[PDB]
Design a binder for these strands. Structure first.
Ligand SMILES: [Mg+2]
Ligand SMILES: [Mg+2]
Ligand SMILES: [Mg+2]
Ligand SMILES: [Mg+2]
Ligand SMILES: [Mg+2]
Ligand SMILES: [Mg+2]
Ligand SMILES: [Mg+2]
Ligand SMILES: [Mg+2]
Ligand SMILES: [Mg+2]
Ligand SMILES: [Mg+2]
Ligand SMILES: [Mg+2]
Ligand SMILES: [Mg+2]
Ligand SMILES: [Mg+2]
Ligand SMILES: [Mg+2]
Ligand SMILES: [Mg+2]
Ligand SMILES: [Mg+2]
Ligand SMILES: [Mg+2]
Ligand SMILES: [Mg+2]
Ligand SMILES: [Mg+2]
Ligand SMILES: [Mg+2]
Lengths: 190, 139, 201, 175, 109, 252
RNA sequence: GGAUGAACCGAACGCCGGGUUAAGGCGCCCGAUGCCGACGCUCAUCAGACCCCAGAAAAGGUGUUGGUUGAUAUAGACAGCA
RNA sequence: CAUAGCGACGUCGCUUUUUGAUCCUUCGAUGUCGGCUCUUCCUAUCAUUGUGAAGCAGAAUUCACCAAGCGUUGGAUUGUU
RNA sequence: AGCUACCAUCUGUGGGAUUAUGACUGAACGCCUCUAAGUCAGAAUCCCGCCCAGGCGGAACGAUACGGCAGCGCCGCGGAGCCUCGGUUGGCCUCGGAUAGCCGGUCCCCCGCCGGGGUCCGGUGCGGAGUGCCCUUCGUCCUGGGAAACGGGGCGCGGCCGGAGAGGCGGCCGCCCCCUCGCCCGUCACGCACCGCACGUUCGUGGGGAACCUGGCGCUAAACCAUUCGUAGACGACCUGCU
């Protein structure tokens, strides 16, 4: 069976505009600009709203494998709209048993230094993705705040920090040390 | 993106098959590969036809699906397509292709004489314009 | 034909292109293939890389110097594929192979010459859009080719000189179209003859 | 059995007259075969499984091709059958859209061979019947029941790949 | 003042996979790639022209090193426009992939 | 059947063509990967193995037993007279690799340097570069040379200098100079060309090439030993005395 | 013809020309599909490619497709949000 | 505590590093055990690189995956494997 | 002295795609999910480097033959030829590219008079189209009309530029000499009209090898043996030396 059409329409807020070039989406909002292409997916992109900016994606004659990509793009566009208007803020908590984790933020929040994870003298230097700003919060005792436009880059940057602080040759169930992501919040809370 | 859609009343062009080079109209669609096709004014009775020998044109007719040939014939006659089709670039390109193919040896000779003279005058004018545009000396 | 046929390998399938060319060179037609790094192979990149790595392992255990000479240049990889499709162990096959020349990028013997393309061996038409393919240039680079970097910079130079040549040709074409407007009173007689006989719609 | 372009055959046959039943009852079957030779062969094969008949013990009184009543009307066919898989016999109900009854059975033979690797000698059609759109159950058929149906042809693959075999301009697909 | 003959390529002899009938040969006329196009070239005359070391006669001309082998097209081979040809003497195998002229002498039009 | 006890194989497989070296000088085969940030410097130099001796020095390796102690270390004395640059070669980066774009030599080639081109300096009339050097003074040749320089300045990617060692300073019986291409690193192609131009017909001391307490690599040809048995060529295990056909061989 | 093979498929044999087939084939080697072939299925980080035949099982898959049975759903399914 | 680790009763395979079964090649002869030397290959991985699981607190240990690149000894006894 | 021993001393290396595996975003399945599309980290694995040899594989550069007739090269397409090897029978002098999109053109902005952005105009079964384009060959004599007359043609001179990935190629100036010829439609006749016959028509002054004459510009060398050396070595080969 090949479905004739599996469309899905997203809604663009008026404060942000979208310009389409082929299958490349350009999102221009208050918090910055985001570009992401979708040439790897054979879809038709249409802009319905000259008045309220409805964006429609269409797939013609697709099988069950490729109708899943239709909403996959739609979620990506919603993430782009979310980023350019609210931004993604990730909170990571450093947990430890006896050796307190020491975190030093380098220039512009683009580089993070982890000093005394599990009490070993090795110094971990994890480099964030461009456009992602990390910082030590003043809100709590152990919190790292990662703010950036793209959820792709921010969550990837946070996961790099978490995977770096990985216990080895020990019972990971008992040894609970490591920096873990707590919540996936936003900025400006609008 | 797309502008030409397979739909009831769409006028298609028969590239190949037993009815190649004719205009047809779609009555209904079947099995995502064929359709009910009936062009009455182009001398094509109603029959199934695959989409691989269909090229979508820019003309869509207004009649209900699975209508009889009488309604389609009136829909083809009223708001006629024959005059509209022959005025398009697409038809005359096909028309020019036909007369080029059947151009005779003497007709080939006359064109070559015509092509020889026309190219020389135009190339002379281009040379005239080239030196005309050669009078440029500006900081 | 009697002239030298030149084919651009960009967006072409390896086996599909080689079969058509191998028939041509047996017919006494000189064929030159440029930009062999642009040849695409069906199947995803990792599987294609595994195929060549198995090919690498095939060597004479007694003396690898006499073993299968594993070529790493994209031109040579396409060249070896055509050799398989030809009776290279014969005098006719060697003569057929000598009528074939392969190149990476576009050398100055063919940079100023228009390149033909085989529709029947094109990636865009002989491969379904959702299927995975690999680039011979990237595959050659990851298996041992040492000139992917220089080729890209050299090809960057050629595109720039081609664009300037192209834009000059546009200006001539733009000049011609306006020129045809000026010579209109004395040209319509010959133009109408072409209208009657198909040419110049 | 082989295939091709199947035709519908109305086959009427009965037992030979014997001095117990002077006129044994007549039986009618619809056989889809490439030609009437196969249709008469399959008719004896079918009456044998149902009645206690034989080709030598009976005769066929009529064998005529069945012309479709409305070959210019689009209609949905519901086809009931039985067939032998590699590990058992299964009944099936498949729906296809076609102009003629014979075409629909032809589609079913192609579909069963493609989807279940069933050869024609194992497929055993038992009833073909035209049904209304609202009674159709296959979503593949139901997507065509649209009075305002509209779709484009997105990716027109080039078919004249060897005319010309060599050229200078890459083909276009958008139309 | 003109080519006056159709270009053809001596592809090879008519053959099976493991057998070779050298008395007849297969040709490929340039621009002819379909079986229905070959109808014009059925019955036409084809010749193979080569050169040699010794001088030979020339009908109505000075002796030269030009030699020629005569033949004609009998039927079309396959669907792709290839044709069969019978010559007075079987074509030497060194002529494979070389020009064969189509003389148009038995013109049916 | 497998061998009873697995042992490491004899002899490296990274030097398998165990043949006489086709050269006597020993070619560089790899120059340092040039970067434009560093200033202009040279990379290679030629020396002659005079011999060996040993020294006594203080060790500054903390945590070691010889820290702040006295040790002896064998050292090698290699005579390195200053070189003389006589030519410049620039290379162009082809898709097939590298090829010699153009070579420019200098005037006043030393007599010992000219001996390299002659297999028989005695019977020769010493004719090399006699007509080539005549272009260094005429109107046409100097005009031609500048075009070669600018062409090398706009096309080549790496330039190299040819230098010969002054054999007259050395006490060897050999009077024939040794020529070697030396890559010029550290800068733009234009700047290194200008520097190579200013060092033509000049003497390059080793101090301008190397420095104190730095690590370098040595390229050369080992001592010839002639035909040798497998026991010495590959350091295989000897066979016992009871062997019939001899014991300095390989059994299987 | 089955790449190759005493038995398999076809077909048995004086020397030749023409035409037509069998079994099998028609991307290249290599003769033939350089048909605008038809319908679908299938992505394999050891795919698959034809009697003999030259290599695989039981058992699993929420990969995908078809079909059977049963059930729920505008007297509102299912899922998410207390 | 079925499945951390084991798998009775049953059941389907794989390997040709054993011993069987057969006698197709060799009887106008292919040198028959074992040891020494020496090279290569395989993985059903003993150790080493990187991982998952454990009734993995650490340490020690077991199972499993990618994996054959490197390494896998010196001796008494016996011709011995 | 030479050879020589973990029996003494020295030295032994960087990168990439990635497996297993751990993850990101995210559907399928308005939930979840490492996976379907798309991303990340990742190794004694693999490959490359470093190192070893260097193709019936290329590059650049030098010097290129006597003091006596003595060879040779370059320039002449200079002439007359001899022998051999054969193919061929108009050219295209070029964008990048995508295919669920393109192509061309135009107005405003910034990029140093031209590119690239955005409005606009057109085309899209490609017609500013390789199913295409250009040249197109019987030749001359009267003979008019249109095209031109800022024109063409010089194996005619000197100069300039571009092209280096294999540039061996392309373009442009200034001077001199020819025709006012060639392009099309017309007028006017002529040519061996060789009496039906094939290899005709082209590249083409084809390529290669001697060799005669003929002008100018020219150059006057190495290799190998023998000998010597021993950084080398079975012999060869290799490193060397010789008013
Ligand atoms: Mg532990
Ligand atoms: Mg072992
Ligand atoms: Mg003995
Ligand atoms: Mg056979
Ligand atoms: Mg077989
Ligand atoms: Mg026969
Ligand atoms: Mg075959
Ligand atoms: Mg063929
Ligand atoms: Mg026996
Ligand atoms: Mg014997
Ligand atoms: Mg013996
Ligand atoms: Mg033996
Ligand atoms: Mg394993
Ligand atoms: Mg090894
Ligand atoms: Mg002992
Ligand atoms: Mg003892
Ligand atoms: Mg030692
Ligand atoms: Mg979610
Ligand atoms: Mg994974
Ligand atoms: Mg990575």
């Amino acid at each position: 069976m090949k479905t004739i059409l599996s469309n899905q329409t997203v809604d663009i807020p008026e404060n942000v505009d979208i310009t389409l070039k082929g299958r490349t989406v350009i999102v221009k909002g208050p918090r910055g600009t985001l570009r992401r292409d979708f040439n790897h997916i054979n879809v038709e992109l249409s802009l319905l709203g000259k008045k309220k900016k409805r964006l429609r994606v269409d797939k013609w004659w697709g099988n069950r494998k490729e109708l899943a990509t239709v909403r996959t793009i739609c979620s990506h566009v919603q993430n782009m709209i979310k980023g350019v208007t609210l931004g993604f803020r990730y909170k990571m908590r450093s947990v430890y048993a006896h050796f307190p984790i020491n975190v030093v933020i380098q220039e512009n929040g683009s580089l993070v230094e982890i000093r005394n994870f599990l009490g070993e003298k090795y110094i971990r230097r994890v480099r964030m993705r461009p456009g992602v700003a990390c910082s030590v919060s003043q809100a709590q005792k152990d919190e790292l705040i990662l703010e950036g436009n793209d959820i792709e880059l921010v969550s990837n940057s946070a996961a790099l920090i978490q995977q770096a602080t990985t216990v080895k040759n020990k019972d990971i169930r008992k040894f609970l040390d490591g920096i873990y992501v707590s919540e996936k919040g936003t900025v400006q809370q609008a | 993106v797309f502008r030409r859609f397979v739909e009831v009343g769409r006028v298609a062009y028969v590239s190949f098959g037993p009815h190649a080079g004719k205009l047809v109209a779609i009555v209904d669609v079947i099995d995502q590969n064929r359709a009910l096709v009936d062009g009455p004014c182009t001398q094509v009775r109603r029959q199934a036809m695959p989409f691989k020998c269909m090229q979508l044109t820019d003309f869509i007719l207004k009649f209900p699906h699975s209508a009889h040939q009488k309604y389609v014939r009136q829909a083809w006659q009223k708001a006629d397509i024959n005059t509209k089709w022959a005025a398009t670039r697409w038809a005359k390109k096909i028309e020019a292709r036909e007369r080029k193919a059947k151009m005779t040896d003497f007709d080939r000779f006359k064109v070559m004489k015509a092509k020889k003279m026309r190219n020389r005058i135009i190339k002379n004018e281009v040379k005239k314009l080239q030196k005309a545009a050669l009078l440029k000396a500006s900081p | 034909e009697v002239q030298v046929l030149v084919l651009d390998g960009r967006g072409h399938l390896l086996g599909r292109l080689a079969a058509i060319v191998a028939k041509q060179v047996l017919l006494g037609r000189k064929v030159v293939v440029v930009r062999c790094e642009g040849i695409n192979i069906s199947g995803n990149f990792y599987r294609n890389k595994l195929k060549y790595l198995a090919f690498l392992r095939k060597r004479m255990n007694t003396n690898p110097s006499r073993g299968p000479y594993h070529f790493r240049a994209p031109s040579r990889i396409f060249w070896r594929t055509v050799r398989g499709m030809l009776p290279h162990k014969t005098k006719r096959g060697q003569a057929a192979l000598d009528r074939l020349k392969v190149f990476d990028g576009i050398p100055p013997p063919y940079d100023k010459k228009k390149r033909m393309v085989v529709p029947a061996a094109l990636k865009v038409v002989r491969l379904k859009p959702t299927r995975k393919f690999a680039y011979l240039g990237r595959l050659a680079h990851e298996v041992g080719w040492k000139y992917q970097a220089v080729t890209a910079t050299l090809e960057e130079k050629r595109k720039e000189k081609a664009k300037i040549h192209y834009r000059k040709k546009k200006q001539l074409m733009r000049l011609r179209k306006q020129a045809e407007k000026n010579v209109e009173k004395k040209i319509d007689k010959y133009t109408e003859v072409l209208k009657t006989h198909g040419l110049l719609v | 059995k082989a295939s091709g372009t199947l035709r519908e055959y109305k086959v009427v046959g009965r037992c030979l007259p014997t001095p117990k039943c002077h006129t044994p009852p007549l039986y009618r079957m619809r056989i889809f075969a490439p030609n009437h030779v196969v249709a008469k062969s399959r008719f004896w094969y079918f009456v044998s499984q149902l009645k206690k008949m034989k080709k030598s013990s009976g005769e066929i009184v009529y064998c005529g091709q069945v012309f479709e009543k409305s070959p210019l009307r689009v209609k949905n066919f519901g086809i009931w059958l039985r067939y032998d898989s590699r590990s058992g016999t299964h009944n099936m109900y498949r729906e296809y859209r076609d102009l003629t009854t014979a075409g629909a059975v032809t589609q079913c033979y192609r579909d069963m061979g493609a989807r279940h690797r069933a050869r024609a000698h194992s497929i055993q059609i038992m009833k073909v019947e035209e049904i209304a759109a609202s009674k159709c159950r296959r979503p593949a058929v139901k997507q065509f029941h649209d009075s305002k149906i509209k779709f484009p042809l997105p990716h027109r693959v080039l078919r004249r790949q060897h005319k010309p075999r060599f050229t200078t301009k890459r083909p276009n697909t958008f139309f | 003042s003109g080519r006056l003959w159709s270009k053809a390529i001596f592809a090879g002899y008519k053959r099976g996979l493991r057998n070779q009938r050298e008395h007849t040969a297969l040709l490929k006329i340039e621009g002819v790639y379909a079986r229905d196009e070959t109808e014009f070239y059925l019955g036409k005359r084809c010749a193979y022209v080569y050169k040699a070391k010794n001088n030979t006669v020339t009908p109505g001309g000075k002796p030269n090193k030009t030699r020629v082998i005569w033949g004609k097209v009998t039927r079309a081979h396959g669907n792709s426009g290839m044709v069969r040809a019978k010559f007075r003497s079987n074509l030497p195998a060194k002529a494979i992939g070389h020009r064969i002229r189509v003389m148009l002498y038995p013109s049916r039009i | 059947s497998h061998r009873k006890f697995s042992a490491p194989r004899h002899g490296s497989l990274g030097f398998l063509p165990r043949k006489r070296s086709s050269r006597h000088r020993g070619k560089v085969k790899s120059f340092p990967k040039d970067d434009p940030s560093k200033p202009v410097h040279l990379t290679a130099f030629l020396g002659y193995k005079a011999g060996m001796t040993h020294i006594v020095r203080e060790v500054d390796r903390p945590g070691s037993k010889v820290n702040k102690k006295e040790v002896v270390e064998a050292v090698t004395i290699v005579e390195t007279p200053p070189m003389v640059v006589v030519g410049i070669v620039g290379y162009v980066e082809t898709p097939r690799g590298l090829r010699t774009f153009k070579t420019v030599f200098a005037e006043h080639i030393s007599d010992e340097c000219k001996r390299r081109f002659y297999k028989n300096w005695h019977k020769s009339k010493k004719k090399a570069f006699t007509k080539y050097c005549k272009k260094w003074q005429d109107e046409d040749g100097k005009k031609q040379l500048e075009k070669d320089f600018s062409s090398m300045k706009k096309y080549c990617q790496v330039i190299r200098v040819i230098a010969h060692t002054q054999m007259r300073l050395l006490p060897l019986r050999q009077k024939k100079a040794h020529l070697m291409e030396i890559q010029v690193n550290g800068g733009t192609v234009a700047e290194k060309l200008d520097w190579a131009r200013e060092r033509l017909e000049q003497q390059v001391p080793v101090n301008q090439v190397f420095g104190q307490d730095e690590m370098i690599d040595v390229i050369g040809v080992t001592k010839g030993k002639g035909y040798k048995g497998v026991t010495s060529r590959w350091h295989t295990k000897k066979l016992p005395r009871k062997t019939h056909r001899g014991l300095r061989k390989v059994a299987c």
